[PDB]
Structures are given as structure tokens and as C-alpha cells.
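quick one: zinc ion bound model?
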Amino acid sequence: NTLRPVTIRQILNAEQPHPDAEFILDGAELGQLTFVAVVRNISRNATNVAYSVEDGTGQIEVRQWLDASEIRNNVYVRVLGTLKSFQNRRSISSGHMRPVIDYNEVMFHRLEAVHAHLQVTR
Amino acid sequence: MEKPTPLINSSMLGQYVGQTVRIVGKVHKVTGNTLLMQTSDLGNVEIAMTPDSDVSSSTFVEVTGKVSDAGSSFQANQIREFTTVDVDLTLVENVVQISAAFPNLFSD
Amino acid sequence: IYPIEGLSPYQNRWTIKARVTSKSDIRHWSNQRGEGKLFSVNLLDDSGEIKATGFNDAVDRFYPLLQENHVYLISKARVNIAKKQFSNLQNEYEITFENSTEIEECTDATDVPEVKYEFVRINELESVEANQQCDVIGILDSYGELSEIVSKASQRPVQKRELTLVDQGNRSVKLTLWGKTAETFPTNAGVDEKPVLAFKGVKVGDFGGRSLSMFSSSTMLINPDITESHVLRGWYDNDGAHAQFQPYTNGGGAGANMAERRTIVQVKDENLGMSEKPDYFNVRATVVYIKQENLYYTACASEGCNKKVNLDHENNWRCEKCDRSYATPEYRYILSTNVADATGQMWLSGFNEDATQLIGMSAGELHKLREESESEFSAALHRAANRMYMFNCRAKMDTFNDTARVRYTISRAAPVDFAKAGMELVDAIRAYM
DNA sequence: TTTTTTTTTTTTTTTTTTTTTTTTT
Ligand SMILES: [Zn+2]
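yep, here:
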């Protein structure tokens, strides 16, 4: 049970063995995952906050649950979450979402995804 | 759909005429709505800036922009701040190169 | 004849003139489709360096034939894509010896460059950073016995030996030999009468402040005819074997790092801290969860004292050890935190110092915050997760009433240096390309 | 075609195994 650094593209290319199962990326279970991206839109609901998020490789929705005014459009963020499917759509269900520390983290993150992919793959 | 937006340096401009790219650099000069940027590449790039941009008071910047058909000019769509008032450009160069080598992760 | 830099898969008629700078031991294996042997050699000329490898029958044919620092005509071998995971060189290509391969030794050494040395004096080593290549010369003082240990990392026996090296700096440092070079060490001539030993490409470990270890690619010479060695020979024989020396220290781990970097899967797979002797390690991990209940305990208000206190009969806080009571308790952390990386998830415990930076608040400050709303208190904890650290840890056995659990303790947690963690990853990646 | 860079070492502080984002689009 793991925390996989991934690009939105990998999220989008992850296979779901049809029915409604666990996702699979590079022949490995894709549960919890993390990535860095730029907020492009913010939609606020009673139940959740939905962000449209994009990292130069693809775009995805991440919704985090209420039970964030620092976060705004056009801002880098670290996303921690679980990959989920509803009705043929993929989105991240997130608990934690933080304004990126410095830009070097964005760079560090791409490498971490490469490195991870390389290690599951050889 | 969202087309991937390559992270590029100045030498890759030729490969994306008419396409939207993403580029990082240290601000050299700002002359009206034109920005002069130094890339990890060590090459400089002319960026045409949106009316609302306070780039002047920032050190490193990330531009999402469309490459213009003359050489290495640029119509800024969006712009992202960094440094202080400490981006590592060598790190950046390497990420550019490495990202180019893994299109399964960074592209279509 | 071709320069080394000239070699490619696209040309098949070639011969190189090169000197062997280093040579591997003979490696054996087994698995599923295979099980065999190989060795490799590094080669140098005016144009550059290249790795060559022989498999199975090529070992029998060439292993005896090729000797370090000697110069050879090599011909009619395959140029292959380099496997950089197994090499220190930057070359895009490497050479594989086939059965048609011609090797004949040369009488001219003048065309071919000789291994250059950039020596670091033993006293200067503390300025070189760990896990880095370095060159060292000095007098051999003595050497350890050969020890055989199954590395928890691999799970295959290893021959090991330690040498004590000394220079004009009056400081001594330990250096580990591995494998066949380790065993055969006293075979070499003049080894007992205080020889000079010269090392090329040696790993700097921080075990005992600074210590040394060899790589596959590393090289040592015994009394080379080099101006530096005559200086030491002259020096040692005149007043060197007269004065006393310094150990460096800050049994056997010369060249090792007191807490090698590991992944969570490695830590568990290697059963670290499952035997009596504690283990130490570093892990880059992300805080995923902090346990709310029992985050902190009420502690003794005595200077220097931290024992847990309890309410007495006059509703004061009583300490046993210091046998007294205070109106106000001190609050100290007993942090229980779940951290994850790409290989797994693991529980860590932290104490007052390290847990404070993990929350950005002393345990007292947290307590007060909880007294105003649970919401702002869980925000603080919720805010503390999704953050990345280098964790320095020990792993030990605790004995909870007969039963026995391993625990992982944080001794230091530093926030990740993204730039530098980045360059590490670059290096790591380039090895797959 | 084919395989890896190896080891080693200490606090004072509660209880003993923890719940990670919970349901809408
Ligand atoms: Zn006390």
C-alpha cells in the first residue's frame, strides 16, 4: 500500500480492468497518489470544493471535502488523493492540497514520477 | 481534451511554431509589454506580455504561451511567479531534457 | 587503429590501443532463464574511456590475460549500448568480448595516457562529502582480519577487510576492501613492511567522521614508482614510525554511512531493527497522517525532567521522580505519524523537538488551540500532513509485557531540499538512459 | 542475450498500535 508520484497523463492512462475495480498503472495497483499542478478553475459546493487542475501533461478534477482561501487560480499546488471513477469520468478525491513551497518542487516532482515509473518498470 | 504543453527551452522553439508551450526563465529586462527572459538553455527569448502583468517585480517566471512564426517570439497566455524579492536553472535544464525523453509520461 | 571515442555499432573493422584502468572480480549468478559468469574491465586512451565485458567462455579466455595498468591491442568485439546502472563511465557505448575477440599486449606505452591522480590528504577528507569519488595515497599501518557477512541488502555472503592508512597529516583513516581483493590481500609482496598504497576512485563514507570504501571500479597500487610515494617512504622511515596518530571516529563499517538512505520497502524487507542491535537509516517520505488521540502527554515542570505527571488528591500535578507538584503541567509530544513513499507506508514516532517542526507549534501551543475549537486544532494537524521530509531514524525492539514490537523513532527530521533532491534524481535517472 | 556496488552505529519522554478523503459528480 503506497503513495505514488504520478503525472496527470499517467492518471489518465491508468487501466481500469473494466467493471469498477482497482486501477492499474505500470502493472501495479494505483491507490493513493500525489502530484503537482496548477489550479485553473475553482467551483464551490455545499459538500465539496472542485478544482480544475493541469500540469502541462493533461487536466483533471480534484474535489476535496468539507466537514482554502490561500489557494487561487493560476497557482502551483501539491495534491495528495485517491483516484476515483464515476460514470466513465476520472477525478482525484483529495484530503490535502497545499500551495507549492518553491518552483524547484515542481521540477523535483516530474523527476520523482520518472524515477518511480522506472523502478516499477525496469 | 487538453493537449499536453511541452516544457521547453529556447532551442526547442523551432519545433513548436504555432503551438502552446511552457517555458521558465530568469527575468532580464522588461520593456513595456515585452519581457526578455533567460532560459535553462542559456538562450534568451522575447515574450509579448498581456496588459495586466506585474512581471517587473519578479525574478523567475513560468510562461504558458504560443510560439510565433518569425523565430523565437511569443504570445503570453498565462504567467506564473517564483523566486524571492531561488529557482535552480540547471535542475530545470535536466528536467526539460528528461521530460522530452519520456513522452509516455509528459505527452500524447 | 581507432580512438575509443571513435567506436560505434556502425563500423566492424576496428582495433583499439588502450590501458586497463580497472578490472572487476568474476561475477556468478543464477535465476530463471540463466545462471553464469562474467567480468569487466575499464579502458582508457587519449580519446576517452570505455567499458568492456566478457561473459561465460570469454572469462576463461581473457580474465587471466588482462591486467591493470597494462596496455593492450583489442580487436573484433561488439559495440553495445552501455548499461549505465552498472558503470561509472558516461559513455553511450560499451564493448562485449565475443569468441572472435583478439587481445595482444603492447610494448609501447607512450601513446596511451597513464592514470592521473588528484590526491586528497587524509586530514582534508573531512571536507569531501559522503558517497563521492576521491583519490588517496598513504602508508599502510596495519590491516584487519577478513570478515564474512551476509548483507541484509542483497542476501549473499561478502568478503571484507579493513586497512589503516596514514599520512603527514598525522591522521589515520579506515578503508574497506571487498571481495577477492580482500581475501588475497596478504598474498601481495611487501605488504607487512609498511608499504605505500595508492588509491584511485574510492568512496567516502561518514562512519567514524570519515572512512573509505572501494568500488568495483576502484584501484590500488603497492609501492608505485611515483614521486608522492617516495616522499611518504622517506617521511615515514625517518619520523613517521616515531609519532602517534588520530583515529577520526565521530568493529566493522569502514566506508559505510551511519544510516544509509533506504526506501520503506527496503527497511521492512531487510528486517531492520528486528535483532538486538539497533539499525539506523534515512528515508525521504511524506507525512500522510498524525494520530490525534494521545499526541501529547502532561509532563513534569522540573528543569531537565520530562517524566509523565498525574493529578494528585489536591488536584495538582504530581511527579514521582522529583517527588513534588505543580499547578501547571508541561506538555510534551509523543507523536505517532504514518509516512509513505512509492514503495510503502510506515509508522514513525517522534518526540518534543522533532514533532514541533512537524506541526509548527510546541505541544503547549497546540493544547491551547484545542481549548478554543477542535476545528482549528484538527486544521493544524491536517495542515501538517502532505509535507515531505528527510527522516533520520533508529529501529529497535521494544518489549511490551512479553510481546515484542519493532519501533521506528525519528532522531532528526529535515524538510526536503528540492533543488538538491532533484539533482540526485537526475543522476539516478540518467543511469536508466 | 546474460549482473550489484556491499559494512556499521544509542534517550529518558506514553502506551503499546494508530485510521489517511468518506459519497457527490
Ligand atoms: Zn520530575
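Chain B has one domain: 1-108.
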